[PDB]
């Protein structure tokens, strides 16, 4: 599937491209309803 | 009966190519199994391949030419069949 590995910095556009959204609230899981 | 591989590596002067070609032949004799040339003694296909190697009748060239002969027979038969179908459709 490949024959090499490239590595470098990630432009903010690149990072925002990876993401599928933006996390905004810190709390993870409600305990009264998992 | 396999305890050593020295005869094999003598017939193929490299253990690496030895195990490669022998694994190829064993895969031949295990899936879509070609009948093992040397009469087996109810053994696994691996040692059967090693024995066929060390006896002096399997190697890289022999496997390749057998594959090519199979290709030739297969293509001839299927092309005859496709020509028959071509006449059948007209």
């Amino acid at each position: 599937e490949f024959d090499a590995i490239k590595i470098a910095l990630a432009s903010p556009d690149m990072i925002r491209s990876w993401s599928f959204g933006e996390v905004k609230k810190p709390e993870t899981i409600n305990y009264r309803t998992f | 009966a396999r305890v050593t591989v020295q005869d094999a590596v003598e017939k193929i002067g490299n253990r690496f190519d030895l195990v490669l070609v022998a694994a190829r032949r064993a895969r031949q004799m295990q899936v879509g199994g070609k009948d093992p040339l040397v009469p087996e003694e109810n053994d696994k296909t691996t040692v059967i391949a090693l024995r066929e190697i060390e006896e002096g009748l399997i190697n890289n060239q022999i496997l390749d030419v057998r594959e090519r002969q199979e290709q030739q027979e297969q293509e001839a038969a299927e092309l005859q069949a496709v020509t028959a179908i071509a006449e059948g459709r007209r």
């Binding site: 556009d13 690149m14 925002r16 491209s17 990876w18 599928f20 959204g21 933006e22 905004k24 | -």
Partner: protein, 267 residues
Amino acid sequence: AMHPMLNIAVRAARKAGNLIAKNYETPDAVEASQKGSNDFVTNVDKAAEAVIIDTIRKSYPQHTIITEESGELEGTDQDVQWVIDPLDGTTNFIKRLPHFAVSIAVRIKGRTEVAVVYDPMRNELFTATRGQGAQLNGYRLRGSTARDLDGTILATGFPFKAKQYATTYINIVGKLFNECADFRRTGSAALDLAYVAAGRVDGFFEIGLRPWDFAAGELLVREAGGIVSDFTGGHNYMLTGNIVAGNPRVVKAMLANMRDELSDALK
């Protein structure tokens, strides 16, 4: 839930697109007039722009509005802008070519927050809100996962308003045809951007585009994994109107290929 301003915008775009479709099946009611180069503008543009402005002011009587016709209607506030194109590809709607869309996006503090384009002929509704992504009629949008300039499809536009670059442009396309597979040309910038974000075409580029012809699509391709840039890798594309967009690999490859063919006027 659903972003509020996004909901208002999509309702307005729905009404505008219904009016568009209504005007479509009547090749008599269209009464256009030429304004630029090889393109008309119709009364339908004015009708749809009016409907959109009214629907917006209903639930937002103070937001600033931007449109090709009305220029910039400065509402009592000036931080929330609504960039509107009641029609992308008016040339096609003239010839009734069933490929066009309405486009509506919202800028907050200069940053595009929500955006929608709407193709009424196929009833396609590309929505996209920042930090949550882009959707096509309820499916996510990730853009073409192609990794190189091979086998890709390249959407583009010919500068019918700035034909001077044509020659240069031609060379560009020529150079690109050395590697890419095929091109695409629909005369609709917004739908090109959408298709890019839709993963239908694996890359888009255009020389000299209007600001309100991408400000909705650019957020789509952004939140659909793709990136946008000018032809020199910078962010000035909003002023030059020179756009390239697509997944990062194909955009990088296109920029590397075009670094030479391009002209210094564009950079």
